[PDB]
Amino acid sequence: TLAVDEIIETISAITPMAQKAKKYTPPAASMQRSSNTIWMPVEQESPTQEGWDLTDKATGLLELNVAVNMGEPDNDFFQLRADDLRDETAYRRRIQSAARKLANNVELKVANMAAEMGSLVITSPDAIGTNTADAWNFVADAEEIMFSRELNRDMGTSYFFNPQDYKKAGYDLTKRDIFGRIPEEAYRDGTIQRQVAGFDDVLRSPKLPVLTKSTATGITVSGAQSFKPVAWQLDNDGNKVNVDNRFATVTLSATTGMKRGDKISFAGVKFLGQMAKNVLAQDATFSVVRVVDGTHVEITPKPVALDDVSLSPEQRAYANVNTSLADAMAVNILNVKDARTNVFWADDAIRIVSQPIPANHELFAGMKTTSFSIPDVGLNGIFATQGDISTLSGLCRIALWYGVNATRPEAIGVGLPGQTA
Amino acid sequence: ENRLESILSRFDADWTASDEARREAKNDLFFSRVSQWDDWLSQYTTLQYRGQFDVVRPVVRKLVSEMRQNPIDVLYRPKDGARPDAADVLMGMYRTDMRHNTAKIAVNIAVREQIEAGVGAWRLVTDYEDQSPTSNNQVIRREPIHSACSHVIWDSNSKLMDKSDARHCTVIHSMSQNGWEDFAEKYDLDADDIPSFQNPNDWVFPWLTQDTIQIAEFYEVVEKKETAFIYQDPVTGEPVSYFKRDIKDVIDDLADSGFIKIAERQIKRRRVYKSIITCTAVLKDKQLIAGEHIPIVPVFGEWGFVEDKEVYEGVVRLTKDGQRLRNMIMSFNADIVARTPKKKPFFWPEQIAGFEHMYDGNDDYPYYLLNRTDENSGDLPTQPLAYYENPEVPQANAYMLEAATSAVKEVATLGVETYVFQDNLATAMRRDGEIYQSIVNDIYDVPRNVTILMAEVVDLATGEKQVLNDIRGRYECYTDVGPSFQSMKQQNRAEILELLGKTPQGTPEYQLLLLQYFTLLDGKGVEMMRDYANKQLIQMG
Known part of the structure; x- marks a missing residue:
C-alpha cells in the first residue's frame, strides 16, 4: 500500500459576518482589574418643554450606558507524537484545520448572537417564491423599519440571506422574461445584487441559525410594570453600580415554551420615532434574552413608555414605545414556524471584544508561545507548544480569546419568512 | 482594516513562512556557542558522562580570522559622464561617520553570525549631534543586531539575497528595564505601560x-508619485525640490530668498515608515524616517530557495551529525575506562585462607602462598589461575570515532577559501552603500560643484530650523567595494603608493614620490619633508 501525500481537499467555508463585524481591543491592564467588562455611554436625548414661565421645572441630566464583556477561550489542544510518521504529516495540516475551525467558530458565535438578540423582526406569511419581487419586499421592509425608527446608519447597513432564500431571490429575478443587466447577472451567477432595496451590502451567509417555533401560548403580562431609564443604582452597601440599558425583566403569567431568542410583541404597544417621539403604526417587537425563573423573562429592548407618568422628563426623553404594559395584555409570539433566519443590521451594532493571552511571559518558561493569526477574520491568538518529560512527544495548544457583544439590539434585526400556521 | 491587525497579519505570515530556516540557524548558534549536547531531556534521568571534544570550533575560528584579515567597505565612484570628482564629498562623509567602533563591531558581529549560523544583519540609524556632527547637526551610525535569524524578519515575497525587494521588515528588540525606560524617554512613549512581544526560547x-x-519595529517602504517643485537658483540653474521636504517650512522662505518657481512635476519615489508595535497595541503608527530603503542590511552564507522556501546555511549545519556522534563515542569510551572492574586474579576463599595479607599489594614477601589440602576432599582441585580481562575499546567504537572525525574534517571545508562568503559580504556592503547614499540625500547637506566651486544652498525658517535643499542631481555616483580606509588622506596615500608601485623610474616616479611626501602626517621631520615636497612641486609648476 502506498500513501501519497496528495491532499484530497474537501471543505471550503467563508466568514462574512465575522469579517464584517467591528473589532475592539480595550487595554488589557485595565480590563484585568475591571473584571473583563467595560462600559460605553449612549447618545444623549434631550427633553423639551414649551412655555414662558418654567419655574421649578428645570430638568436634570441623564446619560445611559451599555456594558461589553468577554467569554472564554476557544482552544485547539492536541497531542503531537514524534516517532509516528503519521503525526509528522498530519500535524502540519492539523494546524491549518485548527485555524479554519477557529475562524468558523467565531463566525458562528457572531451569527447566533445577532439572530438571538435582534430586536427588529420582519415576519412574512408565506415563502419567498410566492409573489413577484417578494425578496425585494422582504429587504425593503427591513430598510423601512430602520428608517422609521430613525436609527443611526452612518457606518452602514447589511442584509444576510441564507442559501435557500438567496436562491429563491435569484429565481425570482430570472423568471422576469426580461434581461437587462440585473437579470443577466442573476442568470450568469447566482448574485441578486450587491445592494438591494437600500442596504449597502446584501450577502448570503451559510451559517445562519434556524429560529425554531415557539410553543408558548396564552401568555399575558402579570401586573402593570413600568420600566425607567437609569444609569446606576444603589447597592446594599450604598455604592453606585452602573445599569445596563439594553435589558428589561418582565413578569408574565407563565413563561413555558419560551427560550433565548424568541420574538414577541405585546398587544397595544407601538414603536416610536425615537428622536421625534411620533407613534408608528408598527407593533413594537422585543426579543427574549433569558428565561429567568418561571414567571419572568428578560427582553432586550427596554420598553420605556411615552405615556408613563412615573417617568421624570429626562427619563421620558428616552421613550421608545407608545404605551406601557397593562397587566393583562396578550404577548403575541412572532416565530410560529421553524425558519432559517435572514439577519440584517447596522454595521456598528455588533462588536467583537478581544483580549490577549500573555503566554510569552517569563512565568511560562519551558513552553514556546508565538502569535497565531486567525485567517479571514481580523483576530490574533496564541500558538503554544511544549514537549513531554520523556518519550519524545509534545503538546500543542492554539488559543483565542474574544467575546461577541451586541451593543445595539434595537439596530440588529431578524427576517422570518413563511410565518403562517 | 485595522492598522494593528494588518501589521500582525503580515508579521505572522513572515514568521511562519521563515520558521524552519530560523529554527535551524538558532540550533547552529546554540551548537556553536553554548553546548554541543543540545538536548533538554538530560535534566530528568541519571547523569552519565557527556563530554564535548570540539573539532568544528578551530575551523570556525580559522574562517572568522580569514574574513577578518581582509576588511571590506563601500567605495563611491562617479557615474559615467559625470564630473571626475563627483563622489569625493559623499565618500568623505561616509568615512567620517563610519570610522567609529560601532560600525566595525556591527560588521564583525554580522560576519561571525554569517559563518556560524548562516545569516547576520546590521542596521543604519540617524541621530542628532551637537559637538562633532558629520553634517546638518546630525550623524549617521551603524548598529549591530545580534541573533538576526530570529530578531530580523523580512517580507516573505522577496527573491533577492540583499532583500531590496522586500516591502516590509520587522525587527524585534529586547531590553532591560532601565533600557526600556530610556527607550520610552527617547520615543516619547509611556514607560509605565510595559510592552510585550514575541521572543520564543x-x-x-x-x-x-x-x-x-x-518590542517590535515595523519598517515599510511605499513607492508613490509625490509632487515636486521646479525653481531657479538665484545663482544659476534650475533645481528640483520635493514638496514634502519644504511643504510649509520654507515654501515661502524660498520665494523670500528669491527662488522663482517655473513648473511642478510628479515624481515617483520611495518613502520609509517605521512603527513601534506590541502584540496588543500600536505605540507609534507611521513615523516617516529618512532614506529610500529599509535601513536593515542582511548578510548570508550559503543562500537559496528550494521550493519557494528560503534556505541559508553556514559551516556548522553539516558537521553537527558527525560531531554529535564523535561526542557520543568518546563519552562511551570514557565510561568504559571509568566504570569497569580492573584486571585482578580470581580466587576461591579456601585457596588463600590464611595468606590473605600476601595478596593485598605489599612488597614484604618473596612469593605468594596457596592452601594446598582440604580436610574433606583431601586435596584442593587444580585449575589454572584466571584474571579479569583488561578493559578494551571496541573495534566498532574505534572505527566510528575515526570515521566521524574524518567526516567532520571532510565536510568542514568552506570552498577549497572564503571567497563566496567575502562576495556575499561585498553584496551586503553595496546594499549598505545604497542605503547610506539615500539617507545622506535625505538629511545631510550635499554641496553641488560648479565649473565657474562648491555651493551649499540652504536657508532658515521662522522657527530657527535649517532645512536642507538637495537638487535632483543627487545620484551622481554608484557603489563599489574596495579596501577599508579610515579617512580620505589614508585612501589618497594608498592610491599614491599603488601608482608608485607600477610607475617606472622616470619623471612620473618623481612626481608620485613628491605627492606621497605631500600627503604625509605631521611631526617635525615629516613636516620638513612635506614642506620640501611643497616647494619642489610648486616651483616645478
Missing part, C-alpha cells in the same frame, strides 16, 4: 532572561 536553552522587555 528554545527548550534546550536552560536560562531565564528575567525582567526584560520586548
Whole structure:
C-alpha cells in the first residue's frame, strides 16, 4: 500500500459576518482589574418643554450606558507524537484545520448572537417564491423599519440571506422574461445584487441559525410594570453600580415554551420615532434574552413608555414605545414556524471584544508561545507548544480569546419568512 | 482594516513562512556557542558522562580570522559622464561617520553570525549631534543586531539575497528595564505601560532572561508619485525640490530668498515608515524616517530557495551529525575506562585462607602462598589461575570515532577559501552603500560643484530650523567595494603608493614620490619633508 501525500481537499467555508463585524481591543491592564467588562455611554436625548414661565421645572441630566464583556477561550489542544510518521504529516495540516475551525467558530458565535438578540423582526406569511419581487419586499421592509425608527446608519447597513432564500431571490429575478443587466447577472451567477432595496451590502451567509417555533401560548403580562431609564443604582452597601440599558425583566403569567431568542410583541404597544417621539403604526417587537425563573423573562429592548407618568422628563426623553404594559395584555409570539433566519443590521451594532493571552511571559518558561493569526477574520491568538518529560512527544495548544457583544439590539434585526400556521 | 491587525497579519505570515530556516540557524548558534549536547531531556534521568571534544570550533575560528584579515567597505565612484570628482564629498562623509567602533563591531558581529549560523544583519540609524556632527547637526551610525535569524524578519515575497525587494521588515528588540525606560524617554512613549512581544526560547536553552522587555519595529517602504517643485537658483540653474521636504517650512522662505518657481512635476519615489508595535497595541503608527530603503542590511552564507522556501546555511549545519556522534563515542569510551572492574586474579576463599595479607599489594614477601589440602576432599582441585580481562575499546567504537572525525574534517571545508562568503559580504556592503547614499540625500547637506566651486544652498525658517535643499542631481555616483580606509588622506596615500608601485623610474616616479611626501602626517621631520615636497612641486609648476 502506498500513501501519497496528495491532499484530497474537501471543505471550503467563508466568514462574512465575522469579517464584517467591528473589532475592539480595550487595554488589557485595565480590563484585568475591571473584571473583563467595560462600559460605553449612549447618545444623549434631550427633553423639551414649551412655555414662558418654567419655574421649578428645570430638568436634570441623564446619560445611559451599555456594558461589553468577554467569554472564554476557544482552544485547539492536541497531542503531537514524534516517532509516528503519521503525526509528522498530519500535524502540519492539523494546524491549518485548527485555524479554519477557529475562524468558523467565531463566525458562528457572531451569527447566533445577532439572530438571538435582534430586536427588529420582519415576519412574512408565506415563502419567498410566492409573489413577484417578494425578496425585494422582504429587504425593503427591513430598510423601512430602520428608517422609521430613525436609527443611526452612518457606518452602514447589511442584509444576510441564507442559501435557500438567496436562491429563491435569484429565481425570482430570472423568471422576469426580461434581461437587462440585473437579470443577466442573476442568470450568469447566482448574485441578486450587491445592494438591494437600500442596504449597502446584501450577502448570503451559510451559517445562519434556524429560529425554531415557539410553543408558548396564552401568555399575558402579570401586573402593570413600568420600566425607567437609569444609569446606576444603589447597592446594599450604598455604592453606585452602573445599569445596563439594553435589558428589561418582565413578569408574565407563565413563561413555558419560551427560550433565548424568541420574538414577541405585546398587544397595544407601538414603536416610536425615537428622536421625534411620533407613534408608528408598527407593533413594537422585543426579543427574549433569558428565561429567568418561571414567571419572568428578560427582553432586550427596554420598553420605556411615552405615556408613563412615573417617568421624570429626562427619563421620558428616552421613550421608545407608545404605551406601557397593562397587566393583562396578550404577548403575541412572532416565530410560529421553524425558519432559517435572514439577519440584517447596522454595521456598528455588533462588536467583537478581544483580549490577549500573555503566554510569552517569563512565568511560562519551558513552553514556546508565538502569535497565531486567525485567517479571514481580523483576530490574533496564541500558538503554544511544549514537549513531554520523556518519550519524545509534545503538546500543542492554539488559543483565542474574544467575546461577541451586541451593543445595539434595537439596530440588529431578524427576517422570518413563511410565518403562517 | 485595522492598522494593528494588518501589521500582525503580515508579521505572522513572515514568521511562519521563515520558521524552519530560523529554527535551524538558532540550533547552529546554540551548537556553536553554548553546548554541543543540545538536548533538554538530560535534566530528568541519571547523569552519565557527556563530554564535548570540539573539532568544528578551530575551523570556525580559522574562517572568522580569514574574513577578518581582509576588511571590506563601500567605495563611491562617479557615474559615467559625470564630473571626475563627483563622489569625493559623499565618500568623505561616509568615512567620517563610519570610522567609529560601532560600525566595525556591527560588521564583525554580522560576519561571525554569517559563518556560524548562516545569516547576520546590521542596521543604519540617524541621530542628532551637537559637538562633532558629520553634517546638518546630525550623524549617521551603524548598529549591530545580534541573533538576526530570529530578531530580523523580512517580507516573505522577496527573491533577492540583499532583500531590496522586500516591502516590509520587522525587527524585534529586547531590553532591560532601565533600557526600556530610556527607550520610552527617547520615543516619547509611556514607560509605565510595559510592552510585550514575541521572543520564543528554545527548550534546550536552560536560562531565564528575567525582567526584560520586548518590542517590535515595523519598517515599510511605499513607492508613490509625490509632487515636486521646479525653481531657479538665484545663482544659476534650475533645481528640483520635493514638496514634502519644504511643504510649509520654507515654501515661502524660498520665494523670500528669491527662488522663482517655473513648473511642478510628479515624481515617483520611495518613502520609509517605521512603527513601534506590541502584540496588543500600536505605540507609534507611521513615523516617516529618512532614506529610500529599509535601513536593515542582511548578510548570508550559503543562500537559496528550494521550493519557494528560503534556505541559508553556514559551516556548522553539516558537521553537527558527525560531531554529535564523535561526542557520543568518546563519552562511551570514557565510561568504559571509568566504570569497569580492573584486571585482578580470581580466587576461591579456601585457596588463600590464611595468606590473605600476601595478596593485598605489599612488597614484604618473596612469593605468594596457596592452601594446598582440604580436610574433606583431601586435596584442593587444580585449575589454572584466571584474571579479569583488561578493559578494551571496541573495534566498532574505534572505527566510528575515526570515521566521524574524518567526516567532520571532510565536510568542514568552506570552498577549497572564503571567497563566496567575502562576495556575499561585498553584496551586503553595496546594499549598505545604497542605503547610506539615500539617507545622506535625505538629511545631510550635499554641496553641488560648479565649473565657474562648491555651493551649499540652504536657508532658515521662522522657527530657527535649517532645512536642507538637495537638487535632483543627487545620484551622481554608484557603489563599489574596495579596501577599508579610515579617512580620505589614508585612501589618497594608498592610491599614491599603488601608482608608485607600477610607475617606472622616470619623471612620473618623481612626481608620485613628491605627492606621497605631500600627503604625509605631521611631526617635525615629516613636516620638513612635506614642506620640501611643497616647494619642489610648486616651483616645478
